[PDB]
């Protein structure tokens, strides 16, 4: 079942954020919600850069690129300076560096691209025409409680991807550790729709090798830090002595 868990303590959290937000949890026995909105877990939003966890299962399992491969800044303006360099597609996740992601997804191209995601299930599965920014603007959409299911089974190899696909691709999304528990996630920020929508999806290895997998998500505008999703999703973890 999907039941609310124990909190007060993080239902204030996000209202002292003047937003509205949930954070699902799903353990090896149980989903519980958290938060001051809990209607949005089950609610479809686009899922933003948390698509790129796919985009890089699919472009690995289909040869299209590889863990080494180096990709070119042709020297175009680029929405941060960070951006603006080579760098592989690990790199790229961690700086979610969207245009190596678009550059990828070209090369898997719609049809390829929406094979596979209708292969897994995520979400509506619905890609439409554009297969350069379908998960930034739609029409993809995913819940948050389909999203903490999809990076469960990615922490766990169970998706339907090579073994080592998935292992190099949850190798990328290591975030922060703190004594020995191992924060691994995908921050995700659409800007561009209304209302905004902010994820940050992953999973906990706790030192003992239990995993908590989460999924955060919340209303976003314009003037919130970037930080404010991990700062709420580390508070929360903690509170609840997943960290």
Same mark, same amino acid.
């Given at each position: 079942?999907?039941?609310? =868990?124990? /909190?007060?303590?993080?239902?204030?959290?996000?209202?002292? #954020?003047?937003? +509205?937000? *949930?954070?699902?949890?799903?353990? %090896? #026995? #149980?989903?519980? &919600?958290?938060? /001051?909105? &809990? +209607?949005?877990? /089950?609610?479809?939003? *686009?899922?933003? +850069?948390?698509?790129?966890?796919? /985009?890089? &299962?699919? =472009? &690995?399992?289909?040869? #299209?690129? %590889?863990i080494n491969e180096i990709f070119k800044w042709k020297g175009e303006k680029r929405s941060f300076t960070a951006w603006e360099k080579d760098m592989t597609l690990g790199e790229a996740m961690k700086l979610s560096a969207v245009p190596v992601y678009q550059e990828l997804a070209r090369r898997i191209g719609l049809d390829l691209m929406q094979k596979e995601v209708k292969r897994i299930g995520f979400g509506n599965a619905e890609i439409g025409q554009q297969v350069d920014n379908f998960w930034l603007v739609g029409p993809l959409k995913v819940t948050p409680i389909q999203e903490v299911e999809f990076v469960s089974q990615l922490a766990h190899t169970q998706l339907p991807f090579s073994e080592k696909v998935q292992a190099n691709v949850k190798n990328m999304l290591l975030l922060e550790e703190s004594n020995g528990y191992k924060i691994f996630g995908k921050t995700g920020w659409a800007m561009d729709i209304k209302p905004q929508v902010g994820w940050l999806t992953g999973w906990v290895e706790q030192p003992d090798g239990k995993i908590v997998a989460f999924a955060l998500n919340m209303e976003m505008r314009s003037e919130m830090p970037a930080s404010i999703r991990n700062e709420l999703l580390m508070k929360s973890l903690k509170q609840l002595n997943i960290i």
């Open positions: 079942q999907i039941v609310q =868990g124990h /909190n007060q303590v993080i239902h204030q959290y996000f209202d002292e #954020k003047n937003t +509205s937000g *949930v954070l699902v949890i799903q353990t %090896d #026995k #149980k989903i519980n &919600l958290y938060g /001051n909105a &809990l +209607s949005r877990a /089950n609610t479809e939003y *686009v899922p933003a +850069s948390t698509f790129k966890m796919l /985009n890089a &299962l699919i =472009g &690995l399992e289909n040869q #299209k690129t %590889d």
